[PDB]
Design a protein around this nucleic acid. Structure first.
Length: 153
DNA sequence: AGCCGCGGAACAAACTTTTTGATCCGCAACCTACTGGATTGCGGCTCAAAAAGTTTGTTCCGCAACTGTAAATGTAATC
C-alpha cells in the first residue's frame, strides 16, 4: 500500500530526472537524487517539493532537517552501501576491517560460539552488497578458511 | 489523532521615580554713606504637574505519550 499510494509521483519525478541526467531511486522513504551535472540538484529539490504538494497533497512534507548534500569530496552513501571515489560499491573501511579481523580470529580459535553466528550473518550479508569481498578473503586467507563458517556446526 | 498543568507573555491599570516650567528669597549690588527710596536684578532652592518607568493581577495562548479483545520468534541489514 505504501508503494501504491506513491506511484504517479514516482513516474513524474523519474520523467523529470530523465531530462536532466538525474538518477532516481527510493526505498520506502529514503529518496536519493543523484546527478553528474553541477548545480542542478536545487532544481530537483524544488521539483520534488512542488510535486509532493500537488498530487498527493500537503499530507507529507520534506523533512527540512536531514536534507544532506554530498560529493566525491566527502563520504557518499545510498542505503548502507558506500560508493567509492573509484566508482565501486563497498561496505566501508570500518566494516571491511571488522569482518576480516573476525574471520582471522576464527583461524586462531580464540572466539566464543556467540560471535560465530555473528560472522555467519556478516559473511552471508557480504554476498548481497559486495559479491567480491569474500573472493578477496579466499585470495588472502584461503578457501579452507571461508568454507568453515558458511557450513559451521 | 486528541490536548494535563506549568510557566512565560501580551496587555493594562496602579505605584513610583524624574523629568520640566514658575516662584521665591537671600544676597550681594546700587546710592551714597550705610534701611536711598518712591530700587532693581541674579543665582541656589523649592514647588507640585505631568510626561516617562516599574510593578503587579488577569487572560489566553503551547505542549507528551500513548490509548479497551491485542506475539516469546536462532544470524546480519534495510525503511
Amino acid at each position: 500500500i505504501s508503494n501504491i499510494v506513491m506511484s504517479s509521483f514516482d513516474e513524474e519525478i523519474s520523467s523529470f530526472c530523465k531530462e536532466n541526467k538525474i538518477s532516481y531511486s527510493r526505498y520506502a522513504d529514503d529518496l536519493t537524487f543523484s546527478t553528474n551535472e553541477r548545480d542542478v540538484l536545487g532544481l530537483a529539490h524544488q521539483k520534488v517539493k512542488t510535486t509532493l504538494i500537488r498530487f498527493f497533497g500537503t499530507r507529507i512534507i520534506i523533512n527540512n532537517n536531514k536534507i544532506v548534500y554530498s560529493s566525491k569530496a566527502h563520504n557518499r552513501h545510498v542505503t548502507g552501501v558506500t560508493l567509492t571515489n573509484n566508482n565501486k560499491l563497498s561496505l566501508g573501511r570500518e566494516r571491511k576491517r571488522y569482518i576480516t579481523s573476525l574471520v582471522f580470529k576464527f583461524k586462531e580459535g580464540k572466539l566464543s560460539n556467540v560471535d560465530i553466528n555473528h560472522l555467519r550473518g556478516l559473511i552471508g550479508f557480504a554476498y548481497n552488497i559486495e559479491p567480491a569481498f569474500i573472493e578477496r578473503l579466499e585470495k588472502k586467507y584461503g578457501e579452507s578458511t571461508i568454507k568453515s563458517i558458511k557450513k559451521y556446526s
